[PDB]
C-alpha cells in the first residue's frame, strides 16, 4: 500500500528532525557552564526505534526518549568557581564536536532521501489516478 | 548513509583524544617527579558478514613512560631522588599504598613527613620526625633527626624510608596520579611491595618530568595531518551521499 | 575548551606562575634576609575513560 | 548468501571487540 | 531493537 | 602600601584562548545555519502537485 | 524537549590583584588582597574600587 | 500524548527560565 | 494572538 509510505516517510522526517535538533543543541552548548539548577549541560541524544505495532517487522521510525550521555563530565580545575566541588574541580558537558557535526551531515543527507522517497510515491500515486484514462 | 563517514570521524575524535593526551604531558614538563603518558591508536576490526572491510581506530593508553628523568640540584636535605625503577612509597588519598618519585618531602608542624600532602610511608608505618628537627636521608633511606640547640653529637637514626622496585609494566597510574600495582603483578608479588634494599637515593636532588620534547613535537605535526585527512575523506563521503540520494527521484 | 585548548591554556598559565616567582626571585636580590621561593607543580585529577 | 541476496535467517550480531578475551 | 543513531553507537566501547 | 600603582589583571592567555574558541564555535553554528537552510529547500518543494 | 538554548552572561569580575609598578610618587596606593578603596560615586551613593 | 496526534486540550504554553526563581 | 516573529523571540530574555 502506498498510502502508508506517508506515515512512514513523515515519521522518518519528523525524527532526523529531532536527531539534526538535538545535534544543534549539543553544538551549541558545548562550552556552557551551567544551567538554571546549577547542573552542567550533559549531552542529549535521541533513541531510534521502529514502529511496526499491528503486526509487523517494518513500520517506520519513532523517537522513543531523549537520553543524557553517560560518559564522563569533563573536569576542569577552578578554585574561585561557585560551582567547583571539594576538590576545585567543576563539570563541562562531555559534547563530542566532531561526532555532533557528523550527525549534523548525516541527518541532513538521510533527511533529503527521505524527502526524495515521499515525492516519488507522492508521483507514483498521481499517476495512479489517471489508471485506465 | 555510507557509514565510511562513521570510521573517519572516530579516526578524527580519538586524534583529539590523542591530542587531549599530549597537551596535558606538555603541562606537566615541569612537574617534579612526573611519569609521561604514553598514548597509541589500535585498530579494532568490525566483526560480520559479509566482507570485512572497516576497521575502527581507538586511542588507548599503554601504561606511562618510566625512562629516568632529569635532575635538579637543590641544596636541601628532604629533596631526595630515587635510583632508576624504584619508587617511593606513600599512604594514598583512600588510606592505601601507594608509589611515586616526587622526593619533594616536607615536615609539618607536628613533625609528619609528607609527600604532595600524603604521608610518607617507612618500615614501620607513617614516619613521625620529633618536632622542628633538622633531617639528613642516607643513601638507603635512613633518617637522622639533629634536635636544635642540642650538639652535633645527639645525631641519630630515626626511621627508614620504604624504596619498592618496580618496573613500568608492573605498575598502573590510579585516578589521582600516584602508581598502584596491576592485578597480576600485584597477585605475584602480593599486596604490599617488600623493600628492596638494593635501592640508593641521592640526598639533595630533585627529579624532574621525563616529557621529551620532540617526540612531543612530531605528535602534534601528525596528528594536525591526520586529522586533516580524515575530514577530506569526511567530506567525500558526505558529497558522495548528497549525488547518490538523486537515485530515488521520479 | 576543546579539553585540548584548556589543557595547554594551563600548562601556559603555570609556566606563567613559575616565571613570575623567578621575576621575583630576581628582583628581591638585594633585599636583606630574604629566602628565595621555588614553585612547585602537581597534575590534577586522571580522568578514566575506558577502563583496561 | 551472495552479497545483496535475499536469505531465510537474519544475519549475524555485529560486535567490535577492543580486546580479544 | 535501537538506540543512539549516530555516533554514540558507532564508536568502539568496552564491554558490558 | 604607597609609592606603588596597581594595574590590571587581564590575563593575555586567556583571553587569547578564548578568542580562538570564539571564532572556531561560530565557524560551527555558521555550519549548522547553512545545513539547515540547504535541508527546508527541499521539504519546501514536496509541497507541489 | 530537544531544544536547548545558549545565553551569555557574566558571573561578575575577577578580583586577582594585577600588576604594581613602582612610581616614587607619595600619592599612589596598592591595597592589599581583597582590599577596597572608598569613593564616593556619581549619584551620591558609596562606590568602591582598587 | 503521542507526538503527531489530535487532542481537545491545548497544548500547554512553553518556558525557557535564565534562572529557576 | 502574536508577536515579533524570528530572531527577536527564538532568544532567551529576562522574565518580565
Known amino acids: ?133 | ?250 | 575548551m576543546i579539553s585540548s585548548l584548556w589543557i595547554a591554556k594551563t600548562g601556559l598559565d603555570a609556566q606563567q606562575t613559575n616565571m613570575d616567582v623567578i621575576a621575583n626571585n630576581l628582583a628581591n636580590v638585594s633585599t636583606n634576609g630574604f629566602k628565595r621561593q621555588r614553585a612547585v607543580f602537581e597534575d590534577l585529577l586522571y580522568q578514566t575513560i575506558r577502563q583496561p | ?21
Request: no cysteine; net charge negative; proline share 7%.
Open chain 2, 1 to 250: 548513509m555510507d557509514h565510511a563517514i562513521y570510521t573517519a570521524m572516530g579516526a578524527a575524535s580519538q586524534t583529539l583524544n590523542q591530542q587531549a593526551v599530549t597537551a596535558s604531558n606538555l603541562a606537566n614538563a615541569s612537574t617534579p617527579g612526573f611519569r609521561a603518558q604514553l598514548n597509541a591508536l589500535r585498530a579494532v576490526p568490525v566483526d560480520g558478514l559479509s566482507l570485512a572491510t572497516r576497521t575502527l581506530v581507538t586511542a588507548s593508553t599503554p601504561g606511562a613512560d618510566m625512562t629516568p628523568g632529569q635532575l635538579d640540584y637543590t641544596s636541601r636535605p628532604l629533596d631526595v631522588a630515587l635510583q632508576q625503577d624504584g619508587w617511593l612509597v606513600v599512604q594514598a588519598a583512600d588510606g592505601a599504598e601507594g608509589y611515586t618519585r616526587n622526593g619533594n618531602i616536607q615536615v609539618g608542624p607536628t613533625g609528619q613527613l609528607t609527600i604532595q600532602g600524603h604521608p610518607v610511608i617507612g618500615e614501620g608505618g607513617p614516619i613521625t620526625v620529633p618536632e622542628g628537627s633538622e633531617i639528613t636521608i642516607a643513601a638507603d633511606g635512613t633518617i637522622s633527626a639533629l634536635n636544635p640547640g642540642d650538639p652535633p653529637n645527639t645525631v641519630a637514626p630515626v626511621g627508614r624510608l620504604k624504596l619498592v622496585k618496580a618496573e613500568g609494566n608492573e605498575v598502573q597510574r590510579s585516578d589521582d596520579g600516584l602508581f598502584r600495582l596491576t592485578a597480576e603483578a600485584q597477585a605475584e608479588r602480593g599486596a604490599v611491595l617488600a623493600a628492596d634494599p638494593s635501592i640508593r637515593i641521592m640526598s639533595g636532588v630533585l627529579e624532574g618530568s621525563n616529557v621529551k620534547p620532540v617526540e612531543a613535537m612530531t605528535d602534534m605535526i601528525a596528528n594536525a595531518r591526520r586529522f586533516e585527512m580524515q575530514m577530506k575523506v569526511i567530506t567525500s563521503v558526505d558529497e558522495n551521499e548528497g549525488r547518490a540520494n538523486q537515485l530515488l527521484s521520479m
Open chain 1, 1 to 133: 500500500a502506498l498510502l502508508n509510505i506517508f506515515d512512514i516517510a513523515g515519521s522518518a522526517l519528523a525524527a532526523q528532525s529531532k536527531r539534526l535538533n538535538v545535534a544543534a543543541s549539543n553544538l551549541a552548548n558545548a562550552d556552557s557552564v551551567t544551567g538554571p539548577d546549577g547542573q552542567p549541560y550533559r549531552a542529549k541524544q535521541v533513541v531510534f526505534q521502529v514502529d511496526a505495532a499491528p503486526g509487523q517487522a517494518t513500520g517506520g521510525v519513532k523517537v522513543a526518549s531523549v537520553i543524557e550521555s553517560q560518559a564522563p563530565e569533563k573536569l576542569v580545575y577552578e578554585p574561585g568557581n561557585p560551582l567547583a566541588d571539594a576538590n576545585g574541580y567543576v563539570k563541562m558537558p562531555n559534547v563530542d564536536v566532531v561526532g555532533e557535526m557528523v550527525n549534523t551531515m548525516s541527518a541532513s543527507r538521510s533527511y533529503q532521501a527521505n524527502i526524495e522517497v515521499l515525492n516519488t510515491v507522492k508521483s507514483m500515486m498521481l499517476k495512479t489516478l489517471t489508471l485506465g484514462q
Open chain 4, 1 to 21: 548468501g551472495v552479497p545483496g541476496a535475499l536469505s531465510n535467517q537474519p544475519a549475524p550480531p555485529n560486535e567490535a571487540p577492543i580486546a580479544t578475551p
